Amino acid sequence: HTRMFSVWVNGVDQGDGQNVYIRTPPNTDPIKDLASPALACNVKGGEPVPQFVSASAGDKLTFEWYRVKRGDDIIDPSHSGPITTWIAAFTSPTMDGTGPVWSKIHEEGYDASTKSWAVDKLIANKGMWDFTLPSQLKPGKYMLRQEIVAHHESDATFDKNPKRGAQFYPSCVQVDVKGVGGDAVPDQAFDFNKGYKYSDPGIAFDMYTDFDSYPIPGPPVWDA
Ligand SMILES: OC[C@H]1O[C@@H](O[C@H]2[C@H](O)[C@@H](O)[C@H](O[C@H]3[C@H](O)[C@@H](O)[C@H](O[C@H]4[C@H](O)[C@@H](O)[C@H](O)O[C@@H]4CO)O[C@@H]3CO)O[C@@H]2CO)[C@H](O)[C@@H](O)[C@@H]1O
Ligand SMILES: [Cu+2]
């Protein structure tokens, strides 16, 4: 359980953008059903909020996460797993992120040199999570997903046992990109509902074992 408080652009807090430029869900509840339409942008994913975060191709974006109160434990430390970041064109305001529209622009999972997960890193850095807007990205409005997966119950799956299974905590943010940018258009055209499966060994994952590495779900990060 956790969700996003606000977004920063090159070290600059844009200010609490919950229901302003973040499609904030009612609560910190997870997604578990792979079939669910909220897998993409969570349970108010399809409801537009009015403001966009104003950034540029190449800007360094920091998403701030919190559990109950801004600047608390961010997420129960049992919730160990990766942290992926995606991008899809803002096709129109009532898009809910479903369909074959997404491209992977960032990830972390399990670094075995340090035996630390992405979630370990996020707690340590106070719920701040950095990534970059590809330099060659084309101008105009996108949607930036970013999703924590907690694997403390992935030692079974939602379809076989529903009291457990992977837990998704996606947050979708509206972005208007300025500046010169480039030609590059995200064209990996990924679909959470089609593309995340219960047979995926990075979704049915026994984190309670002698394991050396973690297969991050979805495609590679996208080039240009
Ligand atoms: O399964 C084999 C493995 O189990 C290990 O223990 C696990 C449990 O399996 C797992 O169910 C448990 O999950 C907890 C979770 O850690 C808590 O953080 C969470 O709390 C939620 C709560 O649901 C909400 O009401 C509240 O608002 O939010 C908090 C989070 O912020 O509750 C779930 C269970 O409901 O995690 C255990 C790990 O500590 C054993 O340790 C291991 O030996 C076994 O091999
Ligand atoms: Cu939780």
Residue type (1 letter), 97: G
The span from the CA of 61 to the CA of 46, in Å, is: 23
The span from the CA of 65 to the CA of 123, in Å, is: 9
The residue contributing the CA closest to ligand 1 atom 44 is: 208
The span from the CA of 217 to the CA of 197, in Å, is: 9
Nearest-atom index, ligand 1, CA of 2: 31
* Ligand 2 centroid to residue 141 C-alpha, Å: 31
Residue owning tokens 């305001």: 93
Closest to 140 measured CA to CA, from 102, 91, 86:
91
- Between the alpha carbon of residue 75 and those of residues 11, 90, 148, the distances in Å are 22, 29, 10
Using alpha carbons only, what angle is made at residue 53 by residues 36 and 195, rounded to the nearest 5 degrees?
25
The residue contributing the CA closest to ligand 1 atom 29 is: 1
The span from the CA of 86 to the CA of 111, in Å, is: 20
Question: Strand (E) positions, the chain?
Answer: 3-9, 12-13, 53-56, 60-66, 83-89, 103-106, 110-111, 116-117, 128-132, 140-150, 167-178
Q: What is the DSSP letter of 216?
A: -
The residue contributing the CA closest to ligand 1 atom 9 is: 153
- Between the alpha carbon of residue 10 and those of residues 64, 148, 157, the distances in Å are 13, 22, 39
**Residues in a beta bridge with 191:** none
Closest to 144 measured CA to CA, from 108, 186, 194:
186
Q: Which ligand is nearest to the CA of 67?
A: 1
Cβ–Cβ < 8 Å for 156, 117? no
The span from the CA of 216 to the CA of 111, in Å, is: 12
Q: Give the dihedral of Cα atoms 129, 135, 140, 146; nearest 10 deg.
A: -20
Q: What is the DSSP letter of 119?
A: H
Which pair of structure tokens corresponds to residue 3? 């969700």
The span from the CA of 178 to the CA of 45, in Å, is: 24
Closest to 130 measured CA to CA, from 26, 4, 9:
9
Is the shortest distance between the CB of 121 and ligand 1 below 6 Å? no
Is the shortest distance between the CB of 73 and ligand 1 below 6 Å? no
Closest to 159 measured CA to CA, from 125, 101, 200:
200
Maximal CA-CA distance, the chain: 50
Sign of CA pseudo-dihedral 158, 24, 74, 146:
positive
Domains (ranges, CATH) in the chain?
A: 2-224 (2.70.50.70)
Does 155 belong to an annotated binding site? yes
Does 45 belong to an annotated binding site? yes
Ion ligand 2 neighbours (CB, 5 A) are: 1
Cβ–Cβ < 8 Å for 108, 121? yes
Q: Give the dihedral of Cα atoms 165, 118, 141, 28; nearest 10 deg.
A: 50
Q: Beta-carbon neighbour count of residue 160 at 10 Å? A: 10
Residue type (1 letter), 16: D
* Buried-exposed string 121-141: b where 16+ CB fall within 10 A, e elsewhere: bbbeeebebebebbeebeeee
Closest to 76 measured CA to CA, from 88, 68, 85:
68
Cβ–Cβ < 8 Å for 222, 105? yes
Which pair of structure tokens corresponds to residue 181? 């940018």
